[PDB]
A paper describes a structure:
[name] type G, the causative agent of necrotic enteritis in broilers, produces two glycosyl hydrolase family 18 chitinases, ChiA and ChiB, which display distinct substrate preferences. Whereas ChiB preferentially processes linear substrates such as chitin, ChiA prefers larger and more branched substrates, such as carbohydrates presented by the chicken intestinal mucus. Here, we show via crystal structures of ChiA and ChiB in the apo and ligand-bound forms that the two enzymes display structural features that explain their substrate preferences providing a structural blueprint for further interrogation of their function and inhibition. We succeeded in obtaining several crystal structures of recombinant ChiA and ChiB in apo (unbound) and ligand-bound forms to resolutions between 1.30 Å and 1.85 Å. Both ChiA and ChiB encode for an N-terminal glycosyl hydrolase family 18 (GH18) Trios-phosphate Isomerase (TIM) barrel followed by a C-terminal putative carbohydrate binding domain (CBD).
The [name] point mutant of ChiA was generated to capture the ligand within a co-crystal structure. E196 is expected to be protonated in the catalytically competent state and act as a general acid/base to protonate the glycosidic bond during the substrate hydrolysis. In the first, bound conformation, the oligosaccharide has descended towards the active site occupying positions -2 to +3. The GlcNAc at position -1 is in the boat conformation, priming it for the formation of the oxazolinium reaction intermediate. In the second, encounter conformation, the elongated oligosaccharide is located at the surface of the cleft and only engages the CBM side of the cleft. Overall ChiA displays the hallmarks of a chitinase processing chitin from its non-reducing end towards the reducing end.
Numbering used by the authors: 47 to 609
């Protein structure tokens, strides 16, 4: 049911054959605790514009004869009656015992967004892609589609730099074309649901970055999603010098990267406020990382935090680093699954865990080597559960499921091998999240905007603007569709998400009233701003920082229903 809490986990297609990933396969998924599994990743084909597999062998061909498929201590065999093998066979086989766990195919990701740029160029290509998604979920027994386009933004040089040859020429239209993509997917998926007697889902994982969001002008697409997953992680990392939290929850005035900003933006709660402009809390999921980022040779800070470093952590502190040329030399990133950091702490008593009571996340600091790594533990899970309950969030998504921890069957005392430590992957944090989501009960239904309860007036209020970080210059066009002049002194109100701060109205007067996740802005015009019948007047002003949209628009205490 719609208001049930959700615990959504991303499954990595590439993990089962990789030492650093722990050889994690579908039978290692936390099936008793997740409500949804997002298979990562499918992509778009450059020549046909259809959904396509990345590692086809892993997805539908691997027989796992060289790997260990077992669950609850019982050997899992591939279902020999299915016309495919691979992860997809194991997913369908497990789902027979977990029929209420929804399976979605995630399309895109950091390295799989490239061909979205050309597929969105025309409506016929979007239609082909959307139809191919329907065919795919039917063929492979999926319950829905997750779109992970990184990113449909005009912000220059956002997304993967390998794709700038496609994204940079398209910046002005990306957001508009993405809105058409999501709407078309919803239309086709809903038709397939009716035809099949099944309730198929459409979701998206979306940016939490104020930098990316400055280039997003239309968040209407959110209304077409079953839920919207905020990527409230990768806030900080080895791409810059700011030794700060990967995935803080609450705004932290000591985050050195944002100390000059209007408010601290690199935390879940800022993105929550941003997206409340277009969605109720129960349709929003918090993103939770089961991986780390970090730095070495950290200068300054306190236990590293708020320090500086031009050298991301390497070596044993970076087992998930990329090998983008080859021969085992990994790009420094301080990137690890949580179980590996636990094992490092077993090995080194001076690698210690600390708690940030402002951001409500932990971190790990080696004071002799000056190594800082982000972390996630039972205390931060508990803080996240508290936030989910307090804010009425729909639940959480997790990147990525092989990073949770449990006891290692292959532990070897004294061994430094990646998969011979005390811990390997497991379900400790995921079970803790699941138990907490069960205990807090279903979400409340957020009430409709109050403007709908007001008496109607045939006035149209259109809110537009332009963003030049950190300044949003708004223009409101007010059209009088009644048969009488509206005298000057009229007022318009709107609810502005608390991701932004109203700064000034350029004409008339204004007031700001606290209203939950919003401030209600009331603009009162001057006596001279009469609105003749069938005419339009425009008023302007300035807002600091960005917001997904405005809500609850009123005019002279009535609901402006236009013409
Ligand atoms: C035009 C201009 O100078 N704009 C400034 C912004 O760049 C800056 O925001 C920061 O932008 C960088 C990218 O240039 C962001 O880093 C990226 O972060 C993502 C994850 O969020 C990571 O995947 C990328 O690898 C990384 N790229 C690079 C090149 O480092 C950074 O997170 C942004 N920080 C914030 C707080 O938004 C803002 C800062 O306010 O200033 C603009 O003037």
């Amino acid at each position: 049911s719609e208001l049930n809490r959700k615990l959504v986990g991303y499954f990595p297609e590439w993990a089962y054959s990789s030492e650093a990933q722990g050889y994690f396969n579908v039978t290692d998924l936390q099936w008793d605790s997740l409500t949804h599994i997002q298979y990562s990743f499918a992509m778009v084909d450059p020549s046909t514009n259809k959904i396509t597999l990345s590692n086809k062998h892993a997805a539908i061909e691997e027989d796992f004869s060289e790997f260990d498929l077992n669950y609850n201590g019982k050997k899992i065999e591939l279902d020999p009656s299915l016309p495919y093998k691979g992860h997809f066979n194991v997913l369908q086989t497990m789902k027979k015992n977990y029929p209420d766990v929804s399976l979605l195919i995630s399309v895109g990701g950091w390295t799989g967004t490239r061909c979205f740029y050309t597929m969105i160029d025309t409506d016929n290509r979007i239609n082909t892609f959307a139809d191919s998604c329907v065919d795919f979920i039917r063929k492979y027994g999926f319950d829905g589609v997750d779109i992970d386009f990184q990113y449909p933004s005009s912000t220059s040089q956002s997304g993967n730099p390998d794709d700038f040859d496609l994204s940079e020429p398209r910046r002005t239209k990306l957001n508009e074309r993405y809105n058409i993509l999501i709407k078309t997917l919803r239309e086709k998926i809903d038709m397939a649901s009716k035809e099949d007697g099944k309730e198929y889902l459409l979701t998206a994982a979306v940016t939490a970055s104020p930098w990316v969001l400055g280039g997003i002008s239309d968040n209407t697409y959110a209304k077409y999603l079953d839920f919207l997953s905020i990527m409230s992680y990768d806030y900080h990392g080895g791409w810059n010098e700011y030794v700060e939290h990967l995935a803080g929850i609450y705004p932290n005035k000591e985050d050195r990267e944002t100390v000059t900003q209007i408010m601290p933006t690199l935390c879940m709660d800022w993105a929550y406020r941003y997206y409340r402009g277009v969605l109720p809390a129960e349709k929003i999921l918090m993103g939770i990382p089961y991986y780390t980022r970090g730095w070495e040779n950290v200068q300054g800070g306190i236990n590293g935090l708020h320090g500086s470093s031009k050298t991301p952590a390497s070596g044993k502190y970076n087992i998930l680093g990329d090998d983008l040329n080859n021969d085992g030399v990994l790009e420094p990133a301080g990137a690890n699954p949580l179980w590996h950091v636990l094992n490092l702490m077993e090995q080194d008593p001076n690698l210690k865990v600390y708690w940030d009571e402002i951001s409500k996340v932990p971190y790990v600091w080696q004071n002799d080597k000056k190594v800082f790594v982000s972390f996630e533990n039972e205390k931060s899970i508990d803080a996240r559960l508290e936030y989910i309950q307090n804010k009425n969030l729909g639940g959480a998504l997790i990147w990525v499921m092989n990073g949770d921890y449990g006891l290692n069957p292959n532990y070897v005392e004294g061994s430094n091998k990646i998969n011979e430590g005390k811990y390997t992957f497991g379900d400790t944090l995921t079970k803790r999240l699941s138990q907490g989501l069960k205990k807090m009960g279903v979400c409340n239904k957020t009430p409709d905007d109050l403007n709908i309860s007001l008496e109607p007036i045939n006035v149209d209020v259109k809110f537009n603007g332009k963003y030049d970080h950190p300044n949003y210059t708004y223009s409101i066009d007010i059209t009088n569709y009644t048969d009488k002049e509206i005298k000057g002194g009229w007022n318009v109100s709107f609810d502005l998400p608390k991701s932004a701060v109203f700064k000034s109205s350029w004409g008339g007067t204004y007031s700001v009233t606290d209203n939950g996740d919003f401030n209600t802005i009331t603009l009162t015009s001057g006596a001279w701003q009469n609105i003749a019948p069938n005419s339009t007047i425009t008023v302007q002003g300035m807002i600091g920082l960005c917001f997904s949209g405005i809500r609850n628009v009123t005019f002279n205490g009535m609901n402006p229903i236009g013409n």
